[model samples]
Target: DSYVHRHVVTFDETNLVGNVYFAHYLHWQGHCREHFLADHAPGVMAALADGLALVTVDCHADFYAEGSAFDEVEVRMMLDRLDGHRIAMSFDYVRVAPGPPTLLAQGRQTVACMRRAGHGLEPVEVPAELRRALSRYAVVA
Candidate 1:
């Protein structure tokens, strides 16, 4: 399963060269992931506010084509890995406006579950509620 979030690029995301900055692709990935968790796993968010944390462990992106401001893009997110202690999601930025659809970029983010331990955080197993919600979007290799 995959979750897609639509977005229109704005000047804020563009560079002097009139192309969307490469960093924004990663930003959109975060937005798509957050929306999925917020919409389908509110329980996980609730836990987050109570000292549970989801910390990014790794992320990377690859650029294929350029997108400019005002372009409509779909940030498609798929759960690539999910387990008791971590979750990973992959993303694709596809431009769908101002021309034919084009693949602009691809990326992935991985995060680890943790809980506050005194003044610090310690890795912890993903809570059951969040795991179930995330599993809905999981794609097996």
Candidate 2:
């Protein structure tokens, strides 16, 4: 995985218990992924211009540790073997400082290039151009 994004654990990202809300990891997952796509996949938004865009069809996360506000978290992400319309990805959130870093959560998501069609969106094959750009950062692990 060539892409590593660092995020500060904000108080707002946590719940009443002062720990990361169970859902925030997935929230962060979507964000870093956006940056990955926008930066790696040129013309990535070309479909959005036509009201189409990549959408997450599946997501999962396993929290191993709790993180408090102000902690630096490194989210290591990698685009999996993408084939056709679906893009599978993985993520790891590690809490830094206070001594050795600790694994906070592990997440995975599958996205698909899609376009708004009728009442919902329909998946579409990623254009060769965009896929080429994405391939630049694709990793087998």
Candidate 3:
């Protein structure tokens, strides 16, 4: 809940019906989540160097309202759970103006930390350094 990324709906994101394509919600979710991770858990960026790989195992979104091109929105995000092997995040896309802020869509994602096994990637606990950085944004829920 500590970071909010502001964004504007662009024409390219709109579908034939003139509203944002359904898939864009997840795109924004991943975008804002990357920003959050880069800002807080910078070490996560060096996963390869640390012999780890970060991957999103689950992602979902629920749409409440449609947004048109040029509309301003804020992607409010928070860490819902940060544990040994998984990091869960939640998001809310709110239209900020034209009148008042309105809910657009809500999304959630779970990222798993993995490491190279004998020949493939296997789940691994999040490193202490990255965990410390991510702790700053963790919510009780």
Candidate 4:
């Protein structure tokens, strides 16, 4: 739950054909971000809730297999690269069946650390504590 996105695909998330829409996987990635923060930096979400947010600025995804309703999916995350003001990470999603795990999709996103000013958000260096929290997973730059 902390590092992985594991949830059953519901009919609500599927189309008439019962296939999980490609865009829905992106939604899963978004959902995982909050939990990841909660696990890694407990106070971060409280700060973010006040309008300071680490916003995703860029993203890329690759789809391999079609996901269906009722299929269980596990989306794993990894910090591929990072710096003070921005971070690059990958989300690998797989469909778990009875026997084997099938790769469903993979996504990469770049998130920016920003502070909200009067009317806009300005990029800022990542906090030392937060940096330390992610030190284990971030790649050296």
Candidate 5:
């Protein structure tokens, strides 16, 4: 429960313009993914411990506004979509301001359950237990 957490922007995370760079949002997404897998995908982690690995298929992001250094923000994780062997997640960043929160940016990433054995990359079925865990946050259309 407490495993998922938020990280604030620091001076080191900005660019010459003094605002959060477009790429840093991606770094945060990756940070979130690592924590998510550790907390939700037991099978995936077990596979990793046993010599398997998951690979990212696609990633994209949309920026709404600029965030400067010292601007406290929260990255909320949402389960966007999931299927038998694929999982997608979205991260929404809300800037904590003096008056109200502002929409700073959003990002989405898709990763496929895979194995890193002999061939380049092989697609593997998402473990059943992992699917069940993600089912709780499944999106409805």
Candidate 6:
């Protein structure tokens, strides 16, 4: 399944120069992650509430432009890859004005399926349903 969420850049999301703070991009990515899991990986959400969670093990982003407060932005996300206990996804943030859409930023995050047991989270095999859903985009490299 594919989905897009629209969000307005707010003052709190920007830096002194008015551009969105780099960290906020990751925050938005997390939001998108939940959105995807809620829509496509309901089982994962259930596990999360039961002390199992997907934890980010790797993340990276590249900024092509900047976004400012009041800017309408669309965050486009898609499943990128999935393995036994890891899932990877990509995100792109595009500005909604000024002629052709401008790419403000892009990022990718990799998370490990982990379960909270005893005192800490431990990596575990991704739920079969979740892994199957992500298989469509599994990267073979």
Per lDDT, the best of the predicted structures is 1
Which 10 consecutive positions of candidate 3 have the poorest summed lDDT?
41-50
Models 1 onward score TM values of 0.92, 0.85, 0.88, 0.88, 0.84, 0.85
lDDT of each: 0.87, 0.80, 0.85, 0.79, 0.77, 0.81
Which structure among the candidates has the greatest TM-score? 1
- C-alpha lDDT of candidate 4 relative to the true structure: 0.79
Candidate 4: segments with Cα more than 4 A from true spot: 139-141
Ordered by TM-score, highest first, the candidates read 1, 3, 4, 2, 6, 5
lDDT, candidate 4, 41-63, per-residue tens? 77777787786678888888899
User: Which lDDT tens digits does candidate 5 get at residues 1-102?
Assistant: 122337778989999988998888988888877777778786767778885666788999999989988887777777778776788887788887534899
**Residue 119: error of model 5 in Å?**
3.9
lDDT of 6: 0.81
Tell me which of candidates 1 and 2 scores higher on TM-score: 1
lDDT of 6 by residue, 1-98 (tens): 34576788889888888788899888888888787678777887877777777888989999999788888888887778677788889888989864
Q: Which stretches of candidate 5 lie over 4 Å from their true place?
A: 1-4, 97-99
Clash count per candidate: 0, 0, 1, 0, 0, 0
Q: Candidate 1 has which clashing residue pairs, if any?
A: none
Mind giving the per-residue lDDT tens digits that candidate 3 earns over 4-97? 8888999999999989999888889878977776777777776657687878999989999989999998999887888779989889899997
Please write out the lDDT profile of model 1 over residues 64-132, one tens digit for every residue: 998998999999888888766889889988999988999999899999998887768888998887777
**Sorted by lDDT, highest first, which candidate order results?**
1, 3, 6, 2, 4, 5
Give me the runs in candidate 1 sitting further than 4 Å from their true place. none
Pairwise lDDT winner, candidates 1 and 3:
1
